[PDB]
Design a protein around this ligand. Sequence first.
Ligand SMILES: *CC(=N)NCCCC[C@H](N)C(=O)O
Length: 275
Amino acid sequence: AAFGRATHAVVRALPESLGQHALRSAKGEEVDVARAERQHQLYVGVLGSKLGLQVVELPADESLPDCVFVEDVAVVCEETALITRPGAPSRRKEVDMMKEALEKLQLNIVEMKDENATLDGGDVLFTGREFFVGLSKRTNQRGAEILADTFKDYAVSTVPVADGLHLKSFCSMAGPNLIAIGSSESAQKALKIMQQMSDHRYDKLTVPDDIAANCIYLNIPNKGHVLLHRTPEEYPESAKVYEKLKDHMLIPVSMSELEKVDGLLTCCSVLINKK
Ligand SMILES: *CC(=N)NCCCC[C@H](N)C(=O)O
């Protein structure tokens, strides 16, 4: 029941079509798909081999170039799973296989069915106490409404999100009551709004690089308060911030290839606590 506790991780393999056909917010260097597969493999390795989570590895689908980013199609709170209606029409079929796995994991399933609603899981920050939901190009008010009705035990508050960003493009939970936050103008504004709307203030962990504010926090029983963060090779000055968390078990993980298509750390997994 402690924050960050998980027993299962759902992930999904990369399709070869990702390199050229995955959606991306900015034009940049070419995706090395073979290398991206290696980085994804190490990522899965940490969750399953090193941390002992039961990993469900969904097969890839070439017709769904973004299928690896499973975070966007499912939001899990306790034993309830909200199957989303992704903002990008090209990603909507990714829902089909996620519904399968979560039904097998025997969770209480709720699917976003309103044809006027959109929501990317990447726009959702669950602090352990409430939800913050980015209103972006991908997530609308109606999407936020459905999330609120699904997790009625929790308060849900919206935060404006600019351009091709998601809420977690510049923030994530780094521990209980602790929000990892970028230092950009956008990130600070979003944080101020979050702090202003919440019932409580949150502690924060400020990092110089927005992207490196996206990390994975895991409470692993009899092992540690684990934090998966971007490497010192990717973001040296942010890694130095994480390194000061003496009580955390720090695991640097590279996502350099998938970053080219806006794929960060939280984006590649759905974490579940199954009793
Ligand atoms: C962390 C998170 N869930 N971010 C969403 C990234 C989506 C990338 C993908 N290529 C897309 O554009 O949908």
